[PDB]
Structure 1
Amino acid sequence: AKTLLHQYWDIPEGTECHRKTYAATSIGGASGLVVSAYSVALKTPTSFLEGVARTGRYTFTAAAIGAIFGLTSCISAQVREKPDDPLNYLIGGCAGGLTLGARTRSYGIGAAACAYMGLTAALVKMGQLEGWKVFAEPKV
């Protein structure tokens, strides 16, 4: 789950939408698999078919989130010609939130997910620009 992020981040932004779309869809698929596995372990499905249907629905939802997020961000950075900008990732996060609202079939979840995932995606671009560390190695 480390080499997937390094596969995503090495491409320059706003250059090739297809490779970034595939990489972000891979991130979404991995997130969906781990979430669905925890879901079927902790909450037992009714039968086999229900379990595989729930797992597939979860990974398709998260794969859609990643795919359209990466496509929207790369398209925006291509059109604007400003690749090192958090605005592209803000539009990508809102497009992903709209996708989550369409997957859940509700507008309130869509609007809330647009706002919050846009804020988090913009903050992620800011951290990538300025080298913010979350799991920072000890210094002193």
Structure 2
Amino acid sequence: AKTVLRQYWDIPEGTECHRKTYATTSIGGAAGLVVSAYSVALKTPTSFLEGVARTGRYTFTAAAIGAIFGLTSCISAQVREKPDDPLNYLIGGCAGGLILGARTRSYGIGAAACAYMGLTAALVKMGQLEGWQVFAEP
């Protein structure tokens, strides 16, 4: 609920890189599941009882990416300097291109994932950092 994400945040933003990443890496996978599970209501199947497990083979991910993103900052965090800078908490995004590339084929994703899932990382931090609100009232 607001819960998990909030918990992590009010946790080790720039430091205590372990719990945070272990969390951001497990939550990514958790989110990944949801979509895989959903794929059975709207999409059908044909490999019987065991089939759904087979299906999940394609979703054998999300978790990996989550882990990696946290890991990058986990490895960094206090690294060279404050990884709190707008450009930095970026870094967790791009490794993502590589992640998806590894997951499947090449040239037609791994850049875009590194690209766009790169672009949209920084904003988060940059967002609360200037005090932005998405859902508000007067």
Deviation at 1:19, TM superposition (A): 0.9
Aligned length: 138
Mark the CA change 1:30 to 1:137 in structure 2 (over 3 Å): closer, same or farther. farther
Deviation at 1:2, TM superposition (A): 2.2
**Quick check: 2:12–2:19 contact (8 Å CA) kept in 1?**
no
Deviation at 1:86, TM superposition (A): 2.3
**Higher mean Cα deviation, 62-71 or 120-129?**
120-129
Mark the CA change 1:40 to 1:16 in structure 2 (over 3 Å): closer, same or farther. same
Deviation at 1:58, TM superposition (A): 5.4
**Quick check: 1:90–1:122 contact (8 Å CA) kept in 2?**
yes
Cα distance in structure 2, aligned partners of 1:122 and 1:54: 36
RMSD: 2.1
| Structure 1 runs not aligned, ≥5 long | none
Q: How do residues 73-112 of structure 1 correspond to structure 2 at under 5 angstroms?
A: 73-112=73-112
Deviation at 1:34, TM superposition (A): 1.6
Normalising to structure 2: TM-score of the pair?
Answer: 0.85
**Quick check: 1:28–1:59 contact (8 Å CA) kept in 2?**
no
Mark the CA change 1:64 to 1:134 in structure 2 (over 3 Å): closer, same or farther. same
| Structure 2 runs not aligned, ≥5 long | none
Normalising to structure 1: TM-score of the pair?
Answer: 0.84
**Quick check: 2:25–2:64 contact (8 Å CA) kept in 1?**
yes
**Higher mean Cα deviation, 7-16 or 53-62?**
53-62
**Quick check: 1:74–1:88 contact (8 Å CA) kept in 2?**
no
**Aligned-partner SS, 1:105:** coil
Deviation string 1:59-111 (CA, Å, 9 cap, x unpaired) is 54100010000010232232132142122222110012210121122232000
Deviation string 1:12-69 (CA, Å, 9 cap, x unpaired) is 3331222111111232123112211221111112224564335643554100010000
**Aligned-partner SS, 2:124:** helix
Indicate the structure with greater helix content: 1
Mark the CA change 1:76 to 1:86 in structure 2 (over 3 Å): closer, same or farther. farther
Give identity over the alignment, percent: 96
**Quick check: 2:73–2:91 contact (8 Å CA) kept in 1?**
yes
